Symmetry: D2
Subunit: 116 residues, 4 copies
């Protein structure tokens, strides 16, 4: 649907399961208002965060709680979390996949944006 | 120089030059206080941000102003900026290089943490 | 199925479509024997390369023809192709997803390996 | 020094030290002739591979022996090695840095190509 987060573990070559993800939307007063949250599945994906109607134009932040993920695996990683910030739907509704590839001292994040 | 930031451009295969970087330290009230800032050099590097005396244990955020970089180059970017958030810890290595590899719709960031 | 290749374009934030992919398997005489080939779909994926029965233990090479991809978009990229080489099925049959994220002067490749 | 290779370790957040690297040039019969080799230094770098006189236009392959690196560290890796294949072109910039960021099940590689 309109916003999906996918997380992979580059150490094990596997989905990153049970990763907490918090989504925020910037308000007109400039604060970050909570928008949605959840955790990744067995497949490393988190679906169902929002609907096209709810997912209006705005600046969004996707915070992925990578530190908690590594700590549960016995690892003390470098980053507190990964934060992905972007304008969405400024030229009409799109579908966003926010992917993150995780390693203890590194991550990458990519967006796949498609027109429904 | 306990903290350096290095930014590369994956489209042009070059250092990312003149990228604004802002560094923040987390205050006790959970807000981000400005701490240091600069623009990357012709080698994509930003040095001289802080000193070992003032770079005490705490949580820091490095914000790299990727959107402006791509706008200057005439390429549509996805992210507002790249954020790197981490804890500084005296027990470990005392030189932190925050590296970022930029593409319009993806970035990676890595910490190279060493002793001298 | 047992081997899938997924390719993304980090410039556009989209699947990399119509990318040629050639798979090779190392023979006992040490040469690279052609094993399968195809091109990525509208979704950037290439499925149907092999079956579990055909996909025996071996060292495989997945060559992704990234240069042809960029050239068709007007770009002169750095790499001739991306080549991904790995042992497969040495502890029994697994499912492999070979992902590649492409930029003109950079790529990343990741494997997601699951036990059916 | 027209060619340098730099390797980083995304698990430990460090230079990848003592990684074997072999460089090849494509011969007119389409085979790979050995050209240079070395191990990365304590800074993850390999210099002195060739000279501008002998580094003529052609297609080169840089093979980074990632599997051995991870084996030494006691972590199961995916890839046999990382291969980087590119054409050297006199018309452009004349210093090539081949950078590789390593995780057990993923790697990225980037070319930083500059003039001095
Ligand atoms: O090559 C990459 O994929 C990469 C990914 C994340 C961060 C940096 C990347 N490249 C890179 C990083 C560092 Cl610290 C670096 O060292 O220079 O001081 C180089 Cl040459 C390249
Ligand atoms: O291919 C990579 O190296 C990579 C780079 C950045 C982010 C994620 C990465 N892998 C990746 C792997 C898979 Cl299987 C994937 O989607 O699968 O449905 C995506 Cl979007 C990305």
């Amino acid at each position: 649907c309109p916003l999906m987060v996918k997380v992979l573990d580059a150490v094990r070559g596997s989905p990153a399961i049970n990763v907490a993800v918090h989504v925020f939307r910037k308000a007109a007063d400039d604060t970050w208002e909570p928008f949605a949250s959840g955790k990744t599945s067995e497949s490393g994906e988190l679906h169902g965060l929002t609907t096209e109607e709810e997912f209006v134009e705005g600046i969004y932040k996707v915070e992925i709680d990578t530190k908690s993920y590594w700590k549960a695996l016995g690892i003390s990683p470098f980053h507190e979390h990964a934060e992905v910030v972007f304008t969405a739907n400024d030229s009409g509704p799109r579908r966003y996949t926010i992917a993150a590839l995780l390693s203890p001292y590194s991550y990458s994040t990519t967006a796949v944006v498609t027109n429904p």
